[PDB]
C-alpha cells in the first residue's frame, strides 16, 4: 500500500540522515584551534562535529583532533560527551525499521506495527534531547550550524511523520477487524 511505501521510504530517510549526522563533522562552524595540545599558536576557522573537530583553513587544513570534552555540571558534560541521545535516536530508528520489516512476515500481529510507531516517536524525542544537550553544553564551554546539525534536525521531522503514519496504519488494522463483525 502507498502508506507502507511512504513509511518504508520515510523510515530509511530518517535513519540514514541521523547516522550521517552522528558520523560527520559538520555540526558547527566556530573559530578555534585545529592543532593538537603541543609553538605557533593560532585560532583557525574550524568545522567541529559531535565527536571530532577539524581545521578548515591554514596549513593544518583538514587535520582533525578529538574534542577534549573535559555535581550537575559534570552530569550534562558526561551526557554530551558520550552523546547517548544522538545514538539512542539512531538505535530507536533502526529498531523501528525492523518492526516494519517484521510486519510483512507477520500480518496477523498488529502490535508489531504499533511498536514501530512508538519507536519512531521515541526516536524523535531522543533527538530533541540530543539537540538541546548539544547546544546547552556547546554554550557553557562567532558560530553557525552546518549541515550535519540540520540532517539530525530533518531526521526528527521525518521520524515524527513516519511515526504518525505508522500509528495510522495500526488504527486501520484494528478498524478493519472491528468492521468484520
Amino acid at each position: 500500500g502507498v502508506q507502507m511505501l511512504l513509511t518504508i521510504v520515510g523510515a530509511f530517510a530518517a535513519f540514514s540522515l541521523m547516522t550521517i549526522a552522528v558520523g560527520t563533522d559538520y555540526w558547527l562552524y566556530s573559530r578555534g584551534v585545529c592543532k593538537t595540545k603541543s609553538k605557533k599558536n593560532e585560532e583557525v576557522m574550524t568545522h567541529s562535529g559531535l565527536w571530532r573537530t577539524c581545521c578548515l583553513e591554514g596549513n593544518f587544513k583538514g587535520l582533525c583532533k578529538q574534542i577534549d570534552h573535559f555535581t550537575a555540571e559534570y552530569f550534562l558534560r558526561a551526557v554530551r560527551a558520550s552523546s547517548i541521545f544522538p545514538i539512542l535516536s539512531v538505535i530507536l530508528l533502526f529498531m523501528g525499521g525492523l518492526c516494519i520489516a517484521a510486519s510483512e512476515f507477520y500480518k496477523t500481529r498488529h502490535n508489531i506495527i504499533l511498536s514501530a510507531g512508538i519507536f519512531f516517536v521515541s526516536a524523535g524525542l531522543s533527538n530533541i534531547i540530543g539537540i538541546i544537550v548539544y547546544i546547552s553544553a556547546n554554550a557553557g564551554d562567532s558560530y553557525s550550524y552546518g549541515w550535519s546539525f540540520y540532517f539530525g534536525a530533518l531526521s526528527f521531522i521525518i521520524a515524527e511523520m513516519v511515526g504518525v503514519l505508522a500509528v495510522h496504519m495500526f488504527i486501520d488494522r484494528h478498524k478493519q477487524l472491528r468492521a468484520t463483525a
Binding site: 521515541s122 530533541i128 534531547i129 538541546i132 547546544i135 546547552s136
Partner: protein, 151 residues
Amino acid sequence: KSKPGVFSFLDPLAYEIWMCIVFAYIGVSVVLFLVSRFSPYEWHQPPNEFGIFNSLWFSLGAFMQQGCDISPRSLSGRIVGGVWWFFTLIIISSYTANLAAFLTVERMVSTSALSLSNVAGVFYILVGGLGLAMLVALIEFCYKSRAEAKR
C-alpha cells in the same frame, strides 16, 4: 562564564511560593470536589462533572491561564474558582514582573537574547512529561490487552 542553571526558570519565585502553590492547588481541587458533589440533593446521575479528577484538571488549567471546558455552576463552586482565578492572576503577574526585573538589572551591569541554556529545564520536563504520557498509555493498553487474552 556564569553558566545559568538547568532549573533556573523558577528563580523569580522563591522555593516557598512554589511549594505553596502545590499546596494551594491540592486544597482548591479538594474543596471544589467537595462543594460540588458532596450534597445528594443535587444528584438526580452527577449534577456536575467536577469529580476529583475533573477538579484537579480545572484547577490546573485555571492556573496556567489555559482555559478548559468545564466551569462551576453553583454559588459554592464559584467561590472556589473566583478566588483561584485571582490567586492565579497575581502569581503569574508576579512571575513575569520579577523575571523582568532580573533580566533588566542584569542588563545595567558594567547578545542579550535569552539562550537555550537559560530555559533548558523547561524542555527536559516537557520531553520527560511526554515520555511519561507514553508510558501511562501503554501500561493501560498492555493491561487491558492481557485481560482480553485470558477471557
